[PDB]
Amino acid sequence: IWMFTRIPTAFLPDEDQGVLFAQVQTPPGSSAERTQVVVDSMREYLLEKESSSVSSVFTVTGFNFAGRGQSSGMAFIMLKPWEERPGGENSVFELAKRAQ
Amino acid sequence: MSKFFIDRPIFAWVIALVIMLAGGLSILSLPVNQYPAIAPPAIAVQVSYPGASAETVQDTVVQVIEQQMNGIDNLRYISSESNSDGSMTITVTFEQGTDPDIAQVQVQNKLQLATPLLPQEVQRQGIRVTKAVKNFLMVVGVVSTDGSMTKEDLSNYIVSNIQDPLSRTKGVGDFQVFGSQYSMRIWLDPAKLNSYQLTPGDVSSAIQAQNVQISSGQLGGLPAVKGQQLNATIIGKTRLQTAEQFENILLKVNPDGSQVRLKDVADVGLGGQDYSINAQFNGSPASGIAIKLATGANALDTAKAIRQTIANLEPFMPQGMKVVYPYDTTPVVSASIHEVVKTLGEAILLVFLVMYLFLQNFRATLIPTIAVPVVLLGTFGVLAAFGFSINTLTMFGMVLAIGLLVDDAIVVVENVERVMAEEGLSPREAARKSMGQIQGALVGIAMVLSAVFLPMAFFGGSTGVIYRQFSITIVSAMALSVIVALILTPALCATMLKPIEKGDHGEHKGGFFGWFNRMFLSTTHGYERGVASILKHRAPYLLIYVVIVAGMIWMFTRIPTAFLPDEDQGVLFAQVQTPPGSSAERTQVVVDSMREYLLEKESSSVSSVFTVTGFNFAGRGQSSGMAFIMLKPWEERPGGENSVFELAKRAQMHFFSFKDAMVFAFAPPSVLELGNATGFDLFLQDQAGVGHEVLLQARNKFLMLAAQNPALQRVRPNGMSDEPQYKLEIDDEKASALGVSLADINSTVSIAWGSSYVNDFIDRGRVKRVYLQGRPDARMNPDDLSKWYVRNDKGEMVPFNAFATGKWEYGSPKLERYNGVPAMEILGEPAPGLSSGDAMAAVEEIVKQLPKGVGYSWTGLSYEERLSGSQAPALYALSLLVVFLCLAALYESWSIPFSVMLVVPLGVIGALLATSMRGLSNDVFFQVGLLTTIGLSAKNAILIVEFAKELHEQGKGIVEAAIEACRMRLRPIVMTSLAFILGVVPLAISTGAGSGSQHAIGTGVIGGMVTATVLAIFWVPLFYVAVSTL
Amino acid sequence: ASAETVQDTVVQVIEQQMNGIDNLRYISSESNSDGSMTITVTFEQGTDPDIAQVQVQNKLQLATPLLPQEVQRQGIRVTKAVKNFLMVVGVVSTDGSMTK
Amino acid sequence: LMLAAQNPALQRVRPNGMSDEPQYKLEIDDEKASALGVSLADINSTVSIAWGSSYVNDFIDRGRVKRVYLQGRPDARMNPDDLSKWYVRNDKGEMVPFNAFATGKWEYGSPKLERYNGVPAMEILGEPAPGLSSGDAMAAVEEIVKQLPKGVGYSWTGLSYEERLSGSQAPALYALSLLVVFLCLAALYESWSIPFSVML
Amino acid sequence: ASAETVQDTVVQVIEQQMNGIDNLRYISSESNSDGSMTITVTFEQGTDPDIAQVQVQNKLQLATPLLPQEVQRQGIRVTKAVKNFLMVVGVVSTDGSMTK
Amino acid sequence: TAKAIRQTIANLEPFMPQGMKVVYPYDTTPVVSASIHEVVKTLGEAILLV
Ligand SMILES: CCCCCCCCCCC(CCCCCCCCCC)(CO[C@@H]1O[C@H](CO)[C@@H](O[C@H]2O[C@H](CO)[C@@H](O)[C@H](O)[C@H]2O)[C@H](O)[C@H]1O)CO[C@@H]1O[C@H](CO)[C@@H](O[C@H]2O[C@H](CO)[C@@H](O)[C@H](O)[C@H]2O)[C@H](O)[C@H]1O
């Protein structure tokens, strides 16, 4: 009964499904002028500084998962198979801990 | 199976235990409502074409929609009405079983395809499609106790504040507000407009010009110039909002620089969108909502939850605004759940008593007390599974099932008890012995009763839904009761009962029980002698049997047939019809002289009166009005003199002195959803373009012919009768000779007389509508059109009288169609003591004297009964064939089955006797009650015969076996009859909410239980011997 | 229209009609400053989605006449709502001949 | 969000909305316009064709129906005074300017208003700290929600809604599943001892 | 209207919306000199014809507004029928008094 | 549905004009009736043969 109360609760165990999301949201009022630069940097500071895990990095400005508008962009971060990524610092949970 | 659970009372306890859990888990997911879906699913298509006549609505809207309303599944018929207030309704009606969500989507899709064919003005209105079953849960009423607010204001409020939350209240379904939101009204003055050579058309064009949300793009959109960096939405103006802003939308400016604002030509203020319909609560301006219960909701809980939601709003409501609850169905629903849970309990109590009285043992008394509730709970699980709800009909179903429940338990216990007493066996041994005896016959009787009750389930139509309730709840209980009588109760017997010294019938005990056991021991011997006597002198008795039969038949053809009992719901209708010509103001007085009367003189019965002008149930328009007479709870108005049925008679007489306004009072129908319960419904129909006038001659011939027919009565048209209308002739010769267009004439007459929905403004957030028409005193009389001018080639205002002329003619204030062709509906009913079947026969012959090109079709319950009437004989013949075939297999005999089937009359005679003898009718509750009573009777017969056949086979004479059997079976029979009659009695003598049904069910079973008990105990051995002898 | 108009004249009206729908878990809308809105009606698992859609269409049709004429003539989009993409099928120009 | 950033157990907290944003409140008139310029609302069109790219009709393109848009040049809709460039028609044939009835100021309006169960609302996502579960985060979030101005409540959704359900179920699950084991053993072994032994 | 006119003013405007339809096997169409047209959206075996019809019309009513008024006014038919004719019911004159 | 159709028109013949009879040019149902009637025929022959 004591041991039962001690255990923390989740729903599903977090999984590594070889994917991660960039969620870019420049301060509103801006445009694809700023937004695009803010995006193309983090696309590189990620495609070059982090090519162990990361594979392609499809980017986009306009339609992130939040709003529309020029002050919005994102990216689909595709990764390399599970074999090609040694434990720990190649998990998305880690690849995004410092990517953040 | 029984022998198995006798040694395994724990397993048997477990089964009973899971039946209980399932049933309990089920009783609280189960929908709770007055009735299941009796009416055939239907879909209303509605819209109102402002200013428009019945003709323009029929020929511009209804016809075009009807032409596209096809290729739609399960469609029975389509029927529509076009009205003089510009409203129309097309109702599509589907088979029972049609999913309403599918029906709806199918109808609105074809609407959607037709929408561009409609006039621009109707498209702009909307056209709402909805489910049209009239099975409302309650109706509220937001009434202004003082006179601060009008009907229009109250509405806007209901839709501003009451509505959104009411829709988020748990269990609330579809609902009708009696009115819409505010409309910005603009009332054009013909003189203040003629003085500036301006026309209504200029005002509309202007209003459109200066009240239009301008899109207004983005400030830095895409593409952009390299850099920029700052992008932002540019919000323009949105549409006007206040009356004052509207009063200012400039029309023209004079050469002297002076400007003309809208205010210079008309008044302006928030108002009604449509003023056709008017309603007051006891005298005061009122609106209201009529609410339906959502799929799967609990009728009781939602009524609470409504009142809850409302109350949380009463604080903020303006001064004088009172919410109020004239009609609520919950009292009857609630008064039916209790008046059943009561009778259930009583029955198990009463079984305990007669169980004790006779068996004189507390252990035995517990068995029935366990099993009956086990089975009661089971049945609910079974209902849940099969998709049924807890309703009036499913519950009365449980009440009829009680006899059969109570019996199964008594027969099993009493027989173990007897076997121990006669043969000195031990409980276990007696229990196995007894279930070797019964058992086959129980399986046998489970079949036989299925055969008796299931056919009802395969009735068609509306009456089919009703019977199907009783059918399914009854066979589920019966079936469960048999299962339990084979698993649980013989296990409980083996376990819970003590031994009885062989030969011990308690004649020594002394005291009451000592007296009783000697008394009943003698009664038994007395009965064996009666029977023994009858089996010597047979002929005279078979003779009287034939007299009993002929008596039953004779009696059937003598009792009035009917659909359902005459219930007193707390409500009475009063339809008002002033003369053709009459204004709403006139009608409004006719309905006040009623309210004042009802509300005062009839204070004993009447609580409130909800009155309406412009709406009625045969029609609409200013000569049509009505009162919804509410009535104070059944409790607070006892005695026949304060029955809805009696109040009516008084109300009639009083109103009858109105040689100025046709007025009628009538209790609503048993089941509102269906309307008109006894009678007939049909549409006469122009199936060859003969025309309106011909069609009118047909309906009038029909009427003045049916009234010379002593097979019908009260034969009235449902629609309205043609009334005077003022035609406009326009001489286009003088119009064009004066430089005045023709399209400008029409625009003038629409946008000033009819009214014209121009624009959408914004009121307090929500979007509402801008209406444009002529100020009232400019459009009252024929001379008032001569007040209106139109601009010419140049700028010379030309008065309407310089090119137009009037002329009084007749036309229809309400056009009807049935299945796409013009038509006219006719009601009426069969002559006193004749059947609606007879009435349809008379009518079917009248129809042949109609003009050429006019047919007819039945609709409604007449359409239904025409198809269902044909099947009853077939189903009743299967029923007989299967009951026979089971009895054959059970007794291994083609002939012995006859000795149980011939009890059928024996019980039905006492029912016909009691019900006729007490002035009730051959309706549904009596019919089902009658099958229950014959069920139990045949069960009693089956077992007597079964035991007799066993005794005969172990080597006893036919008469000897019959007497022994009868003696063995008299105790169980008397116990179960004793317990069941007394259980029912309360129904048979009840009063108030639901008492009319409760009487229709009690009266018949008591009667049938009395004659069946006393007669079958003597005639069944007769039949068994009689047939074995052949 | 402003997000505040889109909300007061459209979304709020359509939400009224979606209350009362069988098996409703919750509803979540957005009004945007570009004239766009989305109302999302979510249902308990086991609800048949073809029938939820139909029911949604049934209620919406009642709101429709209460909408601005600029919408009624438009044509409201009703669809089953999946939160997640399965993939992107991209296209890229090798020799630089084609722009975005 | 403040307390979210502060609070030890929370990570990556964020809103789904965007505060407010600058809106150019183009408030115009009719008095100063309808005098020397335009009758009715000839300008109402001028405004929603140059800035707001107006759709006019289709045209076939290499086999396919596509649209034809009509928007003012990029450089003519960039800045607030850049709109005064757009001249309209004068009833008497002449050419009336836009500044003869212009008026355009900055206003602050919301770029994405949200509602939830028919009340305005704001969705805010967030993860749990590393090596804490979603439950811990939830437990935390239900604290940093107590310091809110009475008027503002909360309500879980998506993944979270799904969590809060799964916890509620568990009790009955365990009860019922214990029951069914108890009863089925009690039936198959014709006793109450065995099923009571195995419960323990 | 010419086949070419009906194809590019009506038949293609609808076709471009015919997507996001469940179990959609294939779509075909015809455009003719007599002005008529037909789009036939055929479905997978097992599809509920009621839902197919609801989905088509759901997409068709997004195109409808972009069609020419003279086509809307004519009145569009959406049907869920079999390909062959079941039968034809004819009428003929007795007295030869009635024309075609 | 063929039976249903025969009945809709039958319910309308009484209101038809004078120089006019309804006729059934194409019609697919009779093959169906013919098919099964003809197997019922061979059903009986077999039951007799055996
Ligand atoms: C106690 C026992 C239970 C009864 C409960 C009460 C019944 C509720 C009556 C509801 C009721 C009157 C309400 C007026 C107050 C009445 C006091 C009631 C107080 C009760 C204590 C609502 O009436 C509607 O009110 C609308 C309000 O907006 C109004 O809208 C108008 O203005 C708007 C402004 O903007 C504007 O937008 C809008 O365009 C306008 O049109 C509609 O025109 C008007 O019809 C009547 O509705 C009518 O019902 C008819 C017969 O059922 C029904 O006919 C069909 O179905 C029959 C079915 O059998 C069938 O046989 C008929 O042949 C068939 O034609 C009609 O289809 C239905 O329309």
Author numbering:
A (entry chain C): 553 to 652
B (entry chain B): 1 to 1030
C (entry chain C), E (entry chain A): 52 to 151
D (entry chain C): 703 to 902
F (entry chain A): 302 to 351
Sentences from the paper on this structure:
Among the three components of the complex, active energy coupling and substrate recognition are performed by the inner membrane pump. There are two distinct multisite drug-binding pockets; the proximal and distal binding pocket, in MDR pumps. Here we show drug-bound structures of MexB from P. aeruginosa with high-molecular-mass compounds.
In order to identify bound drugs, we exchanged DDM by the large molecular weight detergent LMNG, which has a molecular weight almost twice as much as DDM. Surprisingly, we clearly detected the electron density of bound LMNG in the DBP of the MexB crystal structure, regardless whether or not drug was included in the crystallization medium. The binding site is composed of the PN1, PN2 and PC1 subdomains7 of the binding monomer of MexB. Two maltose moieties are oppositely elongated towards the exit and entrance of the DBP. As a result, the LMNG molecule spreads throughout the DBP space, indicating that the DBP has sufficient space to accommodate a molecule with a molecular mass of more than 1,000, if it can specifically fit to the binding site.
